[PDB]
Amino acid sequence: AVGIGALFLGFLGAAGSTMGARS
């Protein structure tokens, strides 16, 4: 059950842009 991988990689394919500002 990989929860954070299924949530962020489904988000990135549906949006089409680099959405992760890791400061």
Side-chain angles (χ1 to χ4, degrees):
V2 179
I4 64 167
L7 201 84
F8 195 82
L9 284 61
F11 172 75
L12 208 76
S17 286
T18 62
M19 289 182 173
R22 294 180 181 97
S23 180

